Each structure stands twice: as structure tokens, then as C-alpha cells.
Amino acid sequence: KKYFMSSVRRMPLNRAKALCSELQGTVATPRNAEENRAIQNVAKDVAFLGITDQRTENVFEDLTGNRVRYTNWNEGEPNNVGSGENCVVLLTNGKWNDVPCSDSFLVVCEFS
Amino acid sequence: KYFMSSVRRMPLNRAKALCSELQGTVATPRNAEENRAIQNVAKDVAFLGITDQRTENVFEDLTGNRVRYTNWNEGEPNNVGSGENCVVLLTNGKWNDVPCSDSFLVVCEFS
Ligand SMILES: [Ca+2]
Ligand SMILES: [Ca+2]
Ligand SMILES: [Ca+2]
Ligand SMILES: [Ca+2]
Ligand SMILES: [Cl-]
């Protein structure tokens, strides 16, 4: 099964990726509502998910460039505000929001 | 318990920081079964969450609890040189006490 663990500190996506990979895991990518809720269980505050539309705007892929199916966008999202929000975070209500990849949030790593 | 190994080597302080970052701790085998599980996740010599920093020759986990199960390599623990207060799991599953300042892989443990 997948196991989810949340970080203590906040960091931008690249550092989040490096953290999870240090222990041979990846940034949590929920594939369904059950997994989304499991990530919610460990995330005490807004946290990065392993999803981005960095390749093509409004086409969301996991960090391995594999287009995702399941999404749980908060109402009004994704809105790509300003210069661009190409990363994704899980809000404390379980819904998602696109944010700048350079902004800092907790990270939830995924292992199996 | 779930065990994960790092890919890079680092001293105990950085190892502890790494496991703590994801709310886990450096792996401490409580029996032969856990010892094997940790050995398998590690591809090379790795730190365990055991030290005798507080009292020499009194090995305890990172929370001060004295360890019961031990799997010392023949001749260990020997506290050689100017001292060896940390512990690593060798590639054969046995343990060796080493300087906490030295760098090895780390296996973190989660519940
Ligand atoms: Ca975008
Ligand atoms: Ca947004
Ligand atoms: Ca010693
Ligand atoms: Ca020794
Ligand atoms: Cl030492």
C-alpha cells in the first residue's frame, strides 16, 4: 500500500522533491478520493502534491510527466494567477489549489 | 513500522534531522526480524537509532530507552580510537559502534 508522511518545515517544490527522494519516495500524488483523504490525515496545513502543469499550461501531470486523471480542485481553481501557478497544494479542506512552484508549503511524501 | 533508506551518506546529526523531518526517527531494531528488514532496505552500512553518548557502554535508543535486543559484530562494541558512541548496521546484519561524526547511510523508521 502507499504510506504518506508530512514534513515539519515548509519549502518550495524543488526542495520538496529532493526531500522525498532522499528517502527514495516521491511527492504525494492522490489517485482517488481515498488517497486524498489519507494525505489530509497527515497534512496539518497546506501541503504540496506531486502535480504540475509546467509542461503545458492547464495540462496536469504527476512529477514523472504522467498526465493525471483524478483531481479535486477547490471552487475557482486552477486559476493560474499572475505570472503563473504551475504547482499544486492540498488545502486544509482537502480541495486543491494551483500555486507558484517557488512558494513554500509543507510537503507530503509517498512511499510504497 | 515502515523502514526507508537514504541514498546519500551523512553524520548522525544530519541523519536524525532527516528522519525527524518526516516525523520519523532513525531505525532501531527491537528483534532479529526488524534487524533483517532494516538490513534489506539499506544498500550499504547504515546508522541505527542507538548511542552510548550519555553513559559509555550503555546503549539506548534516541529517546533514552535502554536497548534489549543487540546484534553486535564479533569484537564489538569496542569504542576504538578517541571513542565510538554511535552504531551502524553492517552489510551482514551485525552491528558496529562508530564515531557519530562519521558518514553512513541512514534508515528511518515510521509507524
Ligand atoms: Ca499553471
Ligand atoms: Ca490558484
Ligand atoms: Ca562508546
Ligand atoms: Ca567499533
Ligand atoms: Cl562518537
Side-chain angles (χ1 to χ4, degrees), chain A residues 53 57 80 85-86:
Chain A
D53 67 331
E57 179 60 35
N80 202 53
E85 303 189 298
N86 303 335

Side-chain angles (χ1 to χ4, degrees), chain A residues 55-72:
Chain A
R55 182 184 75 79
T56 298
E57 179 60 35
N58 210 225
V59 174
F60 292 90
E61 312 176 334
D62 63 24
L63 305 186
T64 68
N66 198 13
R67 203 185 168 138
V68 306
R69 178 199 164 286
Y70 172 83
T71 64
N72 191 36

Side-chain angles (χ1 to χ4, degrees), chain A residues 3 5-11 19-24 42 44 107-109 111-112, chain B residues 2 4-10 18-24 41 43 106-108 110:
Chain A
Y3 321 119
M5 302 147 26
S6 174
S7 67
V8 181
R9 65 181 52 166
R10 302 183 303 126
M11 63 200 79
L19 170 59
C20 302
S21 64
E22 189 52 70
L23 290 175
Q24 304 181 85
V42 300
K44 304 182 187 305
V107 61
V108 173
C109 298
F111 303 90
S112 51
Chain B
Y2 304 114
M4 292 71 203
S5 182
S6 64
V7 291
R8 312 184 191 299
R9 303 189 208 302
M10 62 197 80
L18 171 56
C19 304
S20 294
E21 183 57 48
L22 292 167
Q23 307 180 75
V41 73
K43 288 187 63 181
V106 62
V107 175
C108 298
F110 306 85

Side-chain angles (χ1 to χ4, degrees), chain B residues 7 12 15 20 25 36 43 47 53 55 60 62 76 104:
Chain B
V7 291
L12 191 72
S20 294
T25 188
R36 178 58 171 174
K43 288 187 63 181
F47 272 126
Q53 186 57 38
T55 307
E60 49 180 49
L62 307 180
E76 312 297 348
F104 303 92

Side-chain angles (χ1 to χ4, degrees), chain B:
Chain B
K1 295 170 183 169
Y2 304 114
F3 297 115
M4 292 71 203
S5 182
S6 64
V7 291
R8 312 184 191 299
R9 303 189 208 302
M10 62 197 80
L12 191 72
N13 293 153
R14 189 149 54 116
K16 279 194 294 192
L18 171 56
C19 304
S20 294
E21 183 57 48
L22 292 167
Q23 307 180 75
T25 188
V26 184
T28 303
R30 305 298 175 171
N31 55 58
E33 293 67 51
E34 295 189 352
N35 198 78
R36 178 58 171 174
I38 295 166
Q39 190 194 353
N40 293 350
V41 73
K43 288 187 63 181
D44 205 4
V45 182
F47 272 126
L48 295 176
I50 301 168
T51 74
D52 67 331
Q53 186 57 38
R54 285 177 63 206
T55 307
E56 178 61 34
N57 207 219
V58 175
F59 291 84
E60 49 180 49
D61 62 27
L62 307 180
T63 58
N65 302 285
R66 191 164 190 185
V67 299
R68 296 153 218 69
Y69 168 81
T70 63
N71 194 31
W72 296 113
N73 193 34
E74 275 300 334
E76 312 297 348
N78 59 7
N79 196 56
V80 291
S82 53
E84 302 194 298
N85 305 332
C86 276
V87 179
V88 294
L89 176 68
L90 301 170
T91 52
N92 63 0
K94 312 305 283 191
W95 311 350
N96 178 34
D97 57 334
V98 294
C100 296
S101 47
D102 282 352
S103 298
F104 303 92
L105 294 181
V106 62
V107 175
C108 298
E109 164 196 319
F110 306 85
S111 54

